[PDB]
From Swiss-Prot:
Expressed by the liver and secreted in plasma. It comes from Homo sapiens. Binds to various kinds of negatively charged substances such as heparin, phospholipids, and dextran sulfate. May prevent activation of the intrinsic blood coagulation cascade by binding to phospholipids on the surface of damaged cells. Glycans are attached at residue 50. Disulfide bonds join 2-45, 31-57, 61-112, 97-122, 104-142. The chain holds residues 204 to 345 of 345 of the full protein. It is found in: Secreted. Changing residue 132 to S: In allele APOH*3W; loss of phosphatidylserine-binding. This is Beta-2-glycoprotein 1. Residues 60-142 are annotated as: Sushi-like. The lineage of its organism: Eukaryota, Metazoa, Chordata, Craniata, Vertebrata.
Length: 142
């Protein structure tokens, strides 16, 4: 015997329609808009009497700045364009930062994790109004 697995938060679950689920019986998961599955989509019930896993639904992220060039999968892009529809949990990007000492730039990664993506501390976004200031993404790389 296995119990009925609970619907994951911000998602849903499906299983055979029947009084009791015994073993080798399957359950199955999906998520609402703005979330994505973190774990296997299907799950077996096991010999020991418990469920082979328990996936959750992890939230997507608002792009956390109005404008930035970042590296994604090895390629410079504009975060606003590339992720106009938000960021999936697990999506990793790289913001540019200035080493003012050696007058060059370097990158630091940030990841969407369940709705929060923490932009790095070294990163300063500049309005296009502050035209005297220079985007780290244009400084020669260290």
């Amino acid at each position: 015997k296995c119990p009925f697995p609970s619907r994951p938060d911000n998602g849903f679950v499906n299983y055979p329609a029947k009084p009791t689920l015994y073993y080798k019986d399957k359950a199955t998961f999906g998520c609402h808009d703005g979330y994505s599955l973190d774990g296997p989509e299907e799950i077996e019930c096991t010999k020991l009497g418990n469920w082979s896993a328990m996936p959750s639904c992890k939230a997507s992220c608002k792009v956390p700045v109005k404008k930035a060039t970042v590296v994604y999968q090895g390629e410079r892009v504009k975060i606003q364009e590339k992720f106009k529809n938000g960021m999936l949990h697990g999506d990793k990007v790289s913001f540019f930062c200035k080493n003012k000492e050696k007058k060059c730039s370097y990158t630091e990664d940030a990841q969407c994790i369940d709705g929060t993506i923490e932009v790095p501390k070294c990163f300063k976004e500049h309005s296009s109004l502050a035209f005297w200031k220079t985007d780290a993404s244009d400084v020669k790389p260290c």
